[PDB]
Amino acid sequence: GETTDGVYRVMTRRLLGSTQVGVGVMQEGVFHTMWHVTKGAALRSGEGRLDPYWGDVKQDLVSYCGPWKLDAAWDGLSEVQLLAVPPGERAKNIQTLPGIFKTKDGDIGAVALDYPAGTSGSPILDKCGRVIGLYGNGVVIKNGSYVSAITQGKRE
Amino acid sequence: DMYIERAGDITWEKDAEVTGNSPRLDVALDESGDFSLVE
Ligand SMILES: C[n+]1ccc(CN)cc1
Numbered sequence: 001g002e003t004t005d006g007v008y009r010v011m012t013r014r015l016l017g018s019t020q021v022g023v024g025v026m027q028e029g030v031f032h033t034m035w036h037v038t039k040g041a042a043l044r045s046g047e048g049r050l051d052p053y054w055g056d057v058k059q060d061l062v063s064y065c066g067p068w069k070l071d072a073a074w075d076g077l078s079e080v081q082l083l084a085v086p087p088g089e090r091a092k093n094i095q096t097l098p099g100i101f102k103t104k105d106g107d108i109g110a111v112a113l114d115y116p117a118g119t120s121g122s123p124i125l126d127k128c129g130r131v132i133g134l135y136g137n138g139v140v141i142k143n144g145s146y147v148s149a150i151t152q153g154k155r156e
Numbered sequence: 157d158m159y160i161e162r163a164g165d166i167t168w169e170k171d172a173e174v175t176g177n178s179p180r181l182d183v184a185l186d187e188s189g190d191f192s193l194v195e
Pocket residue numbers: 114115116117118119120121135136137138146
């Protein structure tokens with residue numbers, strides 16, 4: 001199937017019509033998405049099949065055809081862009097200054113942008129166009145707003 | 157049966173729409189990968 005680098009929608013025909021369940025990144029021959037989008041199932045790309053290679057429910061990440069390749073990190077100071085891919089809508093860049101998730105195991109950048117659940121897996125990029133993580137695993141705060149962690153995997 | 161469809165290139169857009177605040181939150185991450193607020 002299509003192996004070209006870029007951002008892709010993850011679709012299913014299991015529900016009514018064709019439904020977008022999430023989004024992912026093809027980089028260096030590896031497909032990267034959040035675990036909650038595919039639940040670790042195999043994927044189709046045209047007539048080809050993409051098998052899972054690595055995954056972790058706690059990190060909420062999964063890679064297909066090879067190991068996780070994304071290793072850029074938010075610098076902790078600069079604005080980033082969410083490359084949002086919403087269901088039935090064109091890919092669109094949104095610039096924002098991340099907030100922070102403070103945890104007992106360290107701090108993580110977080111983006112306070114609210115999109116439909118099917119946008120999960122959309123990439124967050126730095127000014128060099130490098131993917132610093134995936135959008136779609138986060139929390140609902142006091143005033144009811146959604147804040148996503150900038151979730152990034154480890155490149156072995 | 158899940159399938160993928162290309163949606164675009166990954167590139168920074170000059171003059172993209174700029175929005176969103178930057179909240180600083182204390183959170184906890186459980187074994188199922190769910191984040192929750194710590195108050
Ligand atoms: C609750 N919620 C909202 C949006 C997303 C998104 N990508 C994931 C989860």
